[PDB]
Amino acid sequence: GKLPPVYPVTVPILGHIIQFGKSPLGFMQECKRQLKSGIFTINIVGKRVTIVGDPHEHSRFFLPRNEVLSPREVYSFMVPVFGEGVAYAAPYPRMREQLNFLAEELTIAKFQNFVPAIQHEVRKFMAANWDKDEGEINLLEDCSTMIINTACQCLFGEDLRKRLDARRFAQLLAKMESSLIPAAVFLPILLKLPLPQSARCHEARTELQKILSEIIIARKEEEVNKDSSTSDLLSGLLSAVYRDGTPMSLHEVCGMIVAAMFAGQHTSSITTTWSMLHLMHPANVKHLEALRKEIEEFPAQLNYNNVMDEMPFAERCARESIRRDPPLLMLMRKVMADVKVGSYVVPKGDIIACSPLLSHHDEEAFPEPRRWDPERDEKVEGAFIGFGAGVHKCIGQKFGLLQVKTILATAFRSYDFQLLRDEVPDPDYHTMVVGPTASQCRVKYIRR
């Protein structure tokens, strides 16, 4: 039919990957300018990637059903992490049941207990590691540690955290993470080759499943000897029954737990770090005042109402941090059948993408897009896609923001911070999940 315009390939069989790596946004905006089109196709190692780079057409990426646009093939490289029959490795109907089960473990009703759990871990961390009148820290490392500790304290019973503490859990997860080859998205041959990565991933997942098995057995013993019963994400998923009457296997529960941590860890840490970096910069002193005012009448011990209902401004700070520097640069689907987008047909076999980095820098949608302004609103409806939308919208958004907001309120109640450079850090685009440049994240905390 009428295909999107294709950016010229001048270096064959790499395509535009190299140019993309150098300046993701600059490159994408150059394609947009040159091809006179928000919808255009680039070439990544010989694979056509059609970018829906016009915010007016977002719904064409986000709304079509799975039969039409499917992320499953994109996620083939993560099958060893999730496990077979888990998440994108399951038929879509089955994945949806699993997602519902996960969301039910992050229901608003469970937030009643999450708030104190999170604040407990935050205080404990600050008391241990931020103990002088002032001191120097790497904010990105400290927020990452807080997020693993807080997520674990919400989601895992004490017995589990004893057998599998944050530190050990992070090691297992990092071993799985460092075994991933996202290049396999564009070079699918990799997924059929024998790779040492495969054995490491399996080692770590099996080790984790073993620990969970031993926790389940121990809990059974606790219940028999005392009436002690632990209610957590583990117990919750284990009690799940699919519509076909079968229960979730331990294999599936393990994969879901792993998948949840993989989703939640970096994104939440990065969002918290950016938010603090912005709030502490002198240019944003008005915003820091608005935050401090928002939390001023909060009890020493926050509760569900405080964080959920009484923090709209902290929430704006979080979303605008994601809006300016989205941790996920490119959302992708396999085109399963020709799809009409704007004035073009995107053909079966393409990878279709929608880029939060590109869309969040559209100047009609977000005037002066490099300026962090929590008071802004999108000027094109649906242009903010920080948490995705439609069929595959984020199910962790509320829990992620609960942690970010709780950490912001707890940190800024007791500390000020000073950046150790003139400007907030540059984003570092070399990672799967993009955050501020780590070596630029050293800051000074100052006890209030």
Ligand X SMILES: O=C(N[C@@H](Cn1ccnc1)c1ccc(-c2ccc(F)cc2)cc1F)c1ccc(-c2nnc(-c3ccccc3)o2)cc1
Burial letters for 236-251: b for 16+ Cβ neighbours within 10 Å, e otherwise?
bbbebeeeeeeebebe
Residues 331-370 that bind ligand HEM (CB under 6 A): 331
Which of ligand X, ligand HEM, none lies near 390, with the C-beta cut-off 5 to 8 A by kind? Answer: none
Query: What does the DSSP assignment read for 307-353?
Result: HHHS-HHHHHHHHHHHHHS-S---EEEEE-S-EEETTEEEPTT-EEE
Please give the backbone phi and psi of residue 281, each rounded to the nearest 5 degrees, phi first. Answer: -70, 135
User: Which among 13-21, 110-118, 259-267, 420-428 is the span making contact with ligand HEM, rule CB under 6 A?
Assistant: 259-267
**Is 31 one of the annotated binding-site residues?**
no
Closest CA to 136 of 407, 421, 400, 335: 421
Q: Quick one: which of 6, 187, 394, 446 contacts ligand HEM (CB under 6 A)?
A: 394
CB of 139 to ligand X, least distance (A): 21
CB of 22 to ligand X, least distance (A): 12
- β-bridge mates for residue 415, sequence order: 447
Q: CA–CA separation, 353 vs 368, rounded Å?
A: 24
Residue 176 in contact with ligand HEM, rule: CB under 6 A: no
Token pair 């990799």 is found at 190
Which of ligand X, ligand HEM, none lies near 433, with the C-beta cut-off 5 to 8 A by kind? Answer: ligand X
Residue nearer to ligand X on the CB measure, 248 or 419:
248
Which of ligand X, ligand HEM, none lies near 330, with the C-beta cut-off 5 to 8 A by kind? Answer: ligand X
Q: Which residues contact 168 (CB under 8 A, 6 or more apart)?
A: none
Which of ligand X, ligand HEM, none lies near 71, with the C-beta cut-off 5 to 8 A by kind? Answer: ligand HEM
Residues 267-326 that bind ligand HEM (CB under 6 A): 267-268, 271, 322
User: Which among 250-258, 345-353, 358-366, 381-389 is the span making contact with ligand HEM, rule CB under 6 A?
Assistant: 381-389
Q: Is 195 left (phi over 0), alpha (psi -120 to 50) or beta?
A: beta
Residues 92-111 that bind ligand HEM (CB under 6 A): 99
Q: What is the signed CA dihedral for 48, 53, 54, 58, rounded to 10 degrees?
A: 80
Residue nearer to ligand HEM on the CB measure, 35 or 117:
117
CB of 263 to ligand HEM, least distance (A): 3
Q: By the criterion CB under 6 A, which residues form the site for ligand X?
A: 87-88, 95, 98-99, 182, 185, 259, 262-263, 267, 328-330, 394, 396, 432-433
**Is 394 one of the annotated binding-site residues?**
yes
Q: CA–CA separation, 76 vs 58, rounded Å?
A: 24
Q: CA–CA separation, 308 vs 311, rounded Å?
A: 7
Q: What is the signed CA dihedral for 147, 395, 111, 416, rounded to 10 degrees?
A: 40
Return the structure tokens found at 272.
Answer: 């918290």
Segment (H or E) for 51? strand 47-52
Binding flags for ligand HEM, 1-20, as an x/- string (CB under 6 A): --------------------
Residue 260 in contact with ligand HEM, rule: CB under 6 A: yes
Q: CA–CA separation, 383 vs 354, rounded Å?
A: 11
CB of 105 to ligand HEM, least distance (A): 9
Q: Annotated binding residues for heme, as ranges?
A: 394
Q: Annotated binding residues, as ranges?
A: 75, 88, 96, 333, 392, 394
- Note the residues at the interface with ligand HEM (CB under 6 A): 71, 99, 260, 263-264, 267-268, 271, 322, 327-328, 331, 386-388, 392, 394-397, 399-400
